[PDB]
Structure formats: structure tokens, C-alpha cells
């Protein structure tokens with residue numbers, strides 16, 4: 053079926069939970085043996101969210117190459133994304149090592165450091181220009197260059213230096229700051245505006261490594277971001293845009309990381325975002 057009318061048909065019939073459970077039943081199951089090794093317990097935020105072995109990002113290190121991060125490679129859309137958990141106190145250096153090694157231009161953050169009164173990720177970037185951060189375990193230096201605070205999101209320019217080689221690179225930090233503590237946003241307008249700002253920066257384009265996107269677990273809000281982006285790109289590429297099937301795209305993405313889209317409300321919000329976004333594109 054088309055999307056917008058499939059949408060009203062699920063609303064009128066109140067069957068979002070059943071649609072979402074079908075997706076959960078059909079989703080791929082692949083091994084995640086490296087994530088579960090005992091030496092990696094303090095590298096995982098949640099015991100039930102792990103990268104598959106076949107798609108995990110490897111650190112360029114011989115001691116321990118593990119990080120909780122996955123490469124989502126979308127062949128028809130010609131887009132790639134790295135989805136990862138919010139960094140932990142003992143993985144902030146690994147996080148920036150990955151950004152460096154994978155040649156990423158942008159980092160997309162969809163959570164606040166504290167939500168619901170608890171810490172959802174480490175403070176992994178510097179908050180003042182004159183107070184830079186040094187990660188001694190991976191030999192990197194990170195400096196805040198500029199910050200632009202808007203009503204729904206903040207954009208930061210950061211300088212990452214590889215201290216071994218003295219090479220430097222400019223990284224863009226896109227921080228969506230207004231996702232509610234509970235539920236999903238009422239309108240997708242600010243989320244779509246944010247997606248378009250990431251696109252306009254070059255961070256999603258083939259001349260750079262894959263964008264790094266995270267929330268707390270790296271599957272819920274993060275899944276919504278890449279699912280909406282890929283669906284809108286396919287609607288622009290194809291002769292028949294009504295052939296784009298959001299459930300089929302989500303199942304393809306779940307071949308590369310488990311659990312993408314965590315609730316039926318997130319599924320409905322993804323439909324809403326793609327529907328409204330397709331009108332603005334034209």
C-alpha cells in the first residue's frame with residue numbers, strides 16, 4: 053500500500069502495536085559473540101543492545117578492537133551510517149578513535165547528557181574553547197572551535213588532532229536538544245528541519261566517511277533518523293515514489309543492527325516524518 057493512506061488505515065484501526073510486533077518477529081538474528089566476551093562488559097551500556105559481528109566497527113588496535121557500533125550500508129539509496137551507543141566514561145577515547153579512523157565529518161547526537169534524572173551518556177566534548185580535552189588512551193586532542201545554539205538544536209565546530217601524526221580535522225557536532233523525556237515529538241517539523249541541516253553540511257555525502265549517529269542505546273531515536281533520511285532519498289531517486297515501503301526499509305536496516313525503532317510510537321512518528329518530508333521536498 054501507499055504510505056499516507058496505510059497510515060490513516062492503521063490510525064483508524066488502532067493497530068500500531070500489532071504492526072510493530074510483526075516487524076519484531078521478522079527481524080534478523082545474527083551472532084554478537086565479540087560484544088559478549090567478558091573483557092568487553094564495561095564497553096556496553098545495556099546488556100541487551102549489542103552490535104552484530106558481521107557489521108560491527110573495528111578499532112585499529114591489536115589489544116582490543118571492540119566498540120558498541122554498527123555500519124548500516126544502504127545499497128540502493130547509496131548512503132551509509134554508523135549507529136552507536138552514547139559513550140561511557142571508559143569509552144570516550146574509543147569513540148573519537150572511531151571518528152578519526154572512519155574519516156567521518158559529522159556526529160549526530162539525539163539525546164541530552166541527563167534525562168529523567170539519570171546520566172544517558174558521558175560529557176564527551178569540551179564546553180569551553182579554552183578548556184580542551186585530551187584522551188590519553190587513544191592519543192587524541194579535541195577542541196571546541198565555535199557553538200551556535202538554536203531553539204531546537206545546537207551545532208558545534210570541533211577540531212580533532214591525532215597527536216601521533218599532528219594531523220588535524222574539522223568535525224561538525226549536530227545536537228538535537230528537544231526530544232521529550234517521554235514519548236515522541238507531537239510534530240515532525242523540527243526533527244525534519246534538523247535532518248536537512250545535517251544534509252546541507254556535507255556530513256552525509258559520499259566524499260566523507262559515514263556519519264556517526266547516537267542516542268543513549270543507539271537504536272531508537274537513532275533508528276528514526278536514518279530510516280527517515282533513507283526513505284526520503286529513495287522517494288527522490290525512484291520513478292514511482294509511492295513504491296517506497298517503510299517497513300521493508302526498516303527490516304533491511306535491522307540486518308545491520310538489532311532493535312532499530314524501539315516502540316510503536318517511534319514507528320508511527322517515522323511514518324509521520326517521511327509523509328510530511330515528502331511534501332516539502334517538492
Ligand SMILES: CC(=O)Cc1ccc(Cl)c(Cl)c1
Pocket residue numbers: 055287292293294295296330334
Ligand atoms: C512516496 C511518495 O508518494 C512520494 C511521491 C513524491 C512525488 C510524486 Cl510525483 C509521487 Cl507519485 C510520490
